[model samples]
Target chain A: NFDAIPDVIQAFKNGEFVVVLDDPSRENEADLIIAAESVTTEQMAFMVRHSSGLICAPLTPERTTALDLPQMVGTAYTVSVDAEHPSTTTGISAHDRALACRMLAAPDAQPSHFRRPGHVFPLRAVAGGVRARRGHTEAGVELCRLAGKRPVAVISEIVDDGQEVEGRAVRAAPGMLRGDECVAFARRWGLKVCTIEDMIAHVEKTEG
Target chain B: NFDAIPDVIQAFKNGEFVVVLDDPSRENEADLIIAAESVTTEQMAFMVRHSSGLICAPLTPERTTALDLPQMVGTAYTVSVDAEHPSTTTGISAHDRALACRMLAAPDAQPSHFRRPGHVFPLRAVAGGVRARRGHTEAGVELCRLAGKRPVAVISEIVDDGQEVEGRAVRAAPGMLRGDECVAFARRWGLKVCTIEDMIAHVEKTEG
Candidate 1:
C-alpha cells in the first residue's frame, strides 16, 4: 500500500486531477485539488462546467492581481483576548474575541493575506460574483502541492446541475454527494484519486 | 518590492517562521507559518511558550493517529436541497450551506479531511482540553508550503506580552499584537517576515 504513494505524487506532477478524501469515514467535504502551476485552462474549464459542488483556487496576491481575480473580504474576526480584560464583558471566549477582532478589521477592507484569495471575492463573470463561491482558503495552496509549494485551485460545492441556485443556503444538490459521485466524476474527467495506497500502488502498477 | 517574494519563500523553505501581514491596514490574523516536518519539538515548545496565541499544525490522518490527537466534529449538513427541501431553512449563502453540511458530519469526527487538521483539535495537554483555544485556521500545510506539500503548523492570534493572563477575553496582552510585535518577534527568533518587499531586502542584507 505504501508503494502507491509515489504513484499518486507522479500523477499529481502530470497535472491530472486528484480528489483527496481527507477522512475515509465521512464522505462530505472531500476536496478536488490540483496544482495550479501544472494545470491547463481547458482542465479548469471542465472542472467548472461539470462539477456540482463548490469550486475555487488559491492564487497568490500577485497571481490574483495578474489574473484580475477577486479577493475574499473577512466578515469574521480571529481575536486574541485575555480572559480578565474588560473586553470580556462583551461575552464569549477568547475565540469569540478573535471573531470579534475580525468583525472590525475585515469589513470594507481588501482581502487579508491571512486568508485565501479566490474565496474572498467571487469571479463576477464566473457565476455572477454574488452566488459563485470560487475562492481558496489559507490552506489550499499547501494542500494541493506534493513536491513543491505552488498555488492551487481547490473547488467544492460545484453547481453542475442546472438548478436555479438563488438566495443563500441552497440545499446541497447531493449534500456531500454519494461516494459513487466521486468515482463518476473521476471517470468523466479522466482523473485519478490521489491517495497514499492508491497512488503508491498506481505507481507500482504503471511503472512496471 | 516584488523581489521580496522569493526571499519569503526561501525562508519558509529553511523551516523558519515567517510572519505574514495579510493586509497592512487591518491586523488580526497574521499567519506565523512553519513546515511541520522540519520542526523540532523544541521549536514547537518555543512557539507555545513564547507566543501568546493559538498554535496549530496540520497533520495527516496517519500522523494524527500517531500523535493520538482527536478530530473535530461537524455540526452542519451538506444535504442538497431543492428550494423546497425542509433543510433549506438556514439563511442564504454557500458558507451557511457548508456549515449546515458540517453540523451533522463533523460533530464528533476528527477535523474532516475537508478541513485543515490543526484547527479542529488542540493538544489536550495545553489547556486540559477545555477553555484553552488551541486551533488555527487559514494557513495550513497546503497553503503555506512553498517547496512541497508536506505538513505545516500555521499559527496566529499571537500576543507577545508580559502579563499574568487569567480568565476569558482579558485584555489581549497586546492580543494579536501589532506590526512592531511581528518585527520584534522575528528578531528574537532569528527569523524573517514573509512579505513581498521586506523579505527581499532583508534577505539581500543578510545573505550579502
Candidate 2:
C-alpha cells in the first residue's frame, strides 16, 4: 500500500488491475451457465445480482463474423448474370447478397465468413456470370457448351410447396438456377447462366 | 435482315454482336465477345479475328441487404487494431475498437455504445494526468458546471497531430480540457466534418 492509497471502491473506480481482454478466438471455455430472467441486458444484469460486486458482464455476439460461406460437393460452376454484355462492365455490388445465398448453399465450406449448412456459391451479381453458355456474353457461356452441359431451366425448388415463414406467405420468385441444370439451360437458350446469393448478416444480434 | 448465316460471320449467326470489354467494372456488360482465329463450330462465326479470346477478368462483389432509410450518417470508424480488446460484440470493427477502449476506461461506459462527448475524458488515457491536474478532461467540465452547459465532448478531435490530415490517421488517444475550451474546440471540429456527395442525385433516382 506504500505506492497506493484508496478503498476497495476507489481501486475499482480507477483501472488499478489493468485488465487486458484477449482475442475471443482464443478464449478458454468453462461452460459458464449464465442464466438470466430474459437473457437480455436488464434481465441479465438483474440475474447476476452483483454476486461479488465485480459488476461483470459477458461479451456480445458470443461468436460471429461479417462474411458468410457455404460448401457443397461438385457444386462450383461458371454462370453468367448478363446475357449479351461485357462480363466486367459494371452492375456488381460490393456485398452480393445473392452470392451469399448460394454460398450458404454449399454443403459446409465457407471462403470468407459465417457457417451456413450445405452448399455455398460465390457470384459476381453485377458483373458476375460463368462461362457455360454459348455466344454473346462475356461472363460465361462456352463453358456450358464445351462442358457438354446444358443450362436447361427448371421450376424453382422453392416452389411447388408454399409455406408460412417469417409471418408471411413464401413463394419462389425466380430463384435463379445453377449446377448441371444451369449449364443445360445456358446451352439450350444460348445465353449465359448466372447463379447468385444474398449474403448479409443481421445488423443486430438475435438469440436462439 | 440477312439471308444465310456467314461461316466466317463477325457476330452471332443472325442478330449477334461481338464485344471486347474495356472497363474492368463493365467487363460483364456485353452479350458476348468472340475472338477466335478459327472455329469448327461457332467461335470463328462470331469474331473473324484473333487467335484466342484470353478471357481473364475480375468479377463484381456480392450484394448485402440494406434498409430503405431516409437519412443516415455512416461513420467508417477506424477502430484501434491494437486496442486492449479488439473484438466486437456488434457494430463495425472500427466502432467496436473504440468501444472496447472506452469500455476499458471508466467501467461506467465500457460497454455503452453511445455517449456524450464530455464523458470522453473519464475513459480517455490521460497523458501525464494533464487534464486531471487542471481539473478538466475535455472542454466541457467547467463551462458545464459554471454556465450550465451539458459539458459535452467529441472524441474525434484528439487524433495525433502527425495523423490528423485525412481523419484516418488519428490515433486512439484522448484529448481533454475545460468545458469552455471543449465548446470552442467543437466549434472548430464541426467545420472539419465531411459529408457524402451525390446524396441528392441518389435520392432523386430512388424516388423517380
Candidate 3:
C-alpha cells in the first residue's frame, strides 16, 4: 500500500495536498496535508473552503519549543499565533495563514517572530510521530519529515460534499469525509492518498 | 511568608479558597484554588462568578493519565470533561462542575466515568510541581499534595473589580488582580494567600 508513498511525498514536496486518512476505529477522517514550508495562499484558500476552516500547523516538540509556542493555558494546542510582521493583516485570511506557516517552518524562526492569540493553530507532535500517536497531527508531521522537508505540515480535516438527489443538490449534514469518500475526494482532486497505517508501517520498515 | 502555609492547608481541606499568586515575572496573576475533592457547589459558584469563569482542574501527570484524560489535540489542556452520571445536567452549572471535580479527584475514577469536551478544563501539572515550574497549575496541585489531599485542585484566575471614584462608579479596564490587589482580595474574602515563590521555597525545604 505504501507504493504510493513516493508519489505522495513527491506531490507534498510539489506543494500539492496529500489526502491522509486515519484509522477507521480512530478519528476515521481524512486530512488534506501539505508541507508547511511550501503551502501557498491558493492552496490554503482551497483547504479553508473545502475542509474545516481551522488550519493547524503540526511541528515536532523541538520545533515547537524553539518557537516558544507554549500550549494554551489548559489545551494541547500551542497558543494560536500569527506572523508578527506587517506583511500579514488580520491573520485570518488564507494569504496570512500561508505566510504564518512559512514563518513557522523557517529554520531560524524564533518566538519573537510571531504574535500569539491569533489565527493559525500550532500542534506539538509526539516525539515518536505516527508510531507513537496514530493521529493526524503526528501523521502530517511524520509525512513532512519523511519527505525530507522541515518536519512541519499544515493540515485540516476534509468534510464531505453536498448530495444530489432527484436532480437537486442537497447539502449533506456537516461531517468529515470517511473511508470511500476520502478515496473519491482524492481522485477528484488528483491528489495522492495515504493512510496512517501505511505511514506507520512504512516508517517501521524503512526507518526502524 | 509561608508561615501561613499551615492555615492555608486547613482552609483548603475545609473546602475554602486558597488564593495562589504566581511569580511576578511569570503570569503574575492570582488564582483561587481549592481541593477538588472537597469543593462544594457554593464554592464552585463563587469561583465561576468572581473569577474568569473558566474553572481549571490541575492534576499530577500520573493522575491525569490514570483518568485517561489526554491533552487536547494540540494544546496543553486535557480534553474538557464532565461527570457522566445523571447528577449533572448541561455540565456548565456550578453543581455540575463540582460533581465533575469530585469525580475527577476520586481514587478509582476511570475514563468511562466522564464525557469529553465538557465544561471543566483539566491541566496536567509537571512531575516536579512548583519546584520545577513556577506556574499556578503546578502550585495548585503541589499545595493539594502537601495538604494530604488528592493532588487535583480546582483553580481560576481572579479578575479585578471595577473602581468607584467619588460618587460615580468608574468601571476599571478588564484585567486580572495582581500583587497587592491579590492580597486585598484574599483579605476581603477571609482567605489565605500564598505566592509561587513561597510554595517553591516550602516544597524545597520540606520535600527536597
User: Mind sharing the TM-score for model 3?
Assistant: 0.51
Model 2 chain B lDDT-worst window of ten = B56-65
In candidate 2 the C-alpha lDDT for residue A208 amounts to 12
lDDT of 2 by residue, A1-208 (tens): 0111112113222211111111124211001011111122221121111111011111111101112211111112221121112321121211121232222222342333322221111221112222121111211111222223221110111001111123111122211122443334323322222221100111012211
lDDT, model 1, position B198: 43
- Candidate with best TM-score: 3
Score chain B of each candidate by TM-score: 0.48, 0.19, 0.91
Q: How well docked is model 3, in DockQ terms?
A: 0.02
CAPRI verdict (incorrect, acceptable, medium, high) for model 1: incorrect
Model 1 lDDT tens row, A1-208: 1114455456566665565443344223334555544343234333333332123344444444443333221211111111222343211222323332232122232323222211111211122111122222322333334435344333433222323323211122323333456556555545555433243233346344
**lDDT tens digits, residues A21-127, model 3?**
88888767788888999777666656654564457899999988898887653124676688998777545555678799999999889899998666687888988
The full ranking of all candidates by TM-score, starting with the best, is 3, 1, 2
DockQ of each two-chain model: 0.02, 0.01, 0.02
Correct interface contacts retained, every candidate: 0.00, 0.02, 0.00
Candidate 2 lDDT score relative to the true structure: 0.19
